[PDB]
Each structure stands twice: as C-alpha cells, then as structure tokens.
C-alpha cells in the first residue's frame, strides 16, 4: 500500500489507488512516488 507521502524510497512504484509493487501494473504512469513513472 503506498502513500501521498509514498512508503517506497526506491523499491516498489505506486499506483493511484495507492499500491507499491513492480512491473507494468503498478505504475502505468499513474503513480504517487518518485522512483516510478519510466514506460
């Protein structure tokens, strides 16, 4: 579960629903963190 403060220094990227996790599914440019948002 991630954060608008984002709970992932550079492990997981977030989702708008607010979910950390890798791969393609997670972020879709749709993310809250900083270490995400590539493809």
Known sequence: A????SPCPGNQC???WG?????GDYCGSGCQ????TGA
């Open 19 to 23: 979910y950390c996790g890798l791969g």
């Open 14 to 16: 977030c989702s708008k």
């Open 33 to 36: 963190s900083g270490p995400c």
């Open 2 to 5: 991630c954060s608008s403060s």
